[PDB]
Amino acid sequence: TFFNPDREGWLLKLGGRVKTWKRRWFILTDNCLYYFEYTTDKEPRGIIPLENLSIREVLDPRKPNCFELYNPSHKGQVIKACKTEADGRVVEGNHVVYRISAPSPEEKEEWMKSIKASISRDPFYDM
């Protein structure tokens, strides 16, 4: 599934039920954002489907080159996502939004462009 990706790279993501930044290797493919703790990891740490989502720039007090993923449909609606836990639990994410920090302004722009392009490409988008 990670074959022929639209983009791969390091990004910082702000935690949900425990708000802290974690460095994760992201892979954009099949209109989903996959993230790994380490680049050569066989299995992803989580998956964030992009369908029905939007992206916007945001200013953070400590992290630069940030943007957020959010669902426009319903107010404060929990974004559909899935993640693995060390104990083996495969649990659904509880994020209303996803604040991401890119390594540079250039990479932020590139990532925002790729994500939007992927979303608009989905033939099942906005239904």
From Swiss-Prot:
Changing residue 94 to A: Slightly reduces phosphatidylinositol 3,4,5-trisphosphate binding. Transmembrane segments: none annotated. Changing residue 20 to A/G: Reduces phosphatidylinositol 3,4,5-trisphosphate binding. It is found in: Cytoplasm, Cytosol; Cell membrane; Cell junction, Adherens junction; Cell junction, Tight junction. A 1,2-diacyl-sn-glycero-3-phospho-(1D-myo-inositol-3,4,5-trisphosphate) binds at residues 13-20, 24, 35, 45, 94. Changing residue 45 to A: Abolishes phosphatidylinositol 3,4,5-trisphosphate binding. Disulfide bonds: none annotated. Residues 4-120 form the PH domain. Changing residue 22 to A: Reduces phosphatidylinositol 3,4,5-trisphosphate binding. Changing residue 83 to A: Abolishes phosphatidylinositol 3,4,5-trisphosphate binding. Promotes guanine-nucleotide exchange on ARF1. Promotes the activation of ARF factors through replacement of GDP with GTP. Plays a role in the epithelial polarization. Binds via its PH domain to the inositol head group of phosphatidylinositol 3,4,5-trisphosphate. Autoinhibited by its C-terminal basic region. Interacts with TAMALIN. Interacts with FRMD4A. Interacts with FRMD4B. This is Cytohesin-3. It comes from Mus musculus (Mouse). The lineage of its organism: Eukaryota, Metazoa, Chordata, Craniata, Vertebrata. The gene is Cyth3. The chain holds residues 261 to 387 of 399 of the full protein.
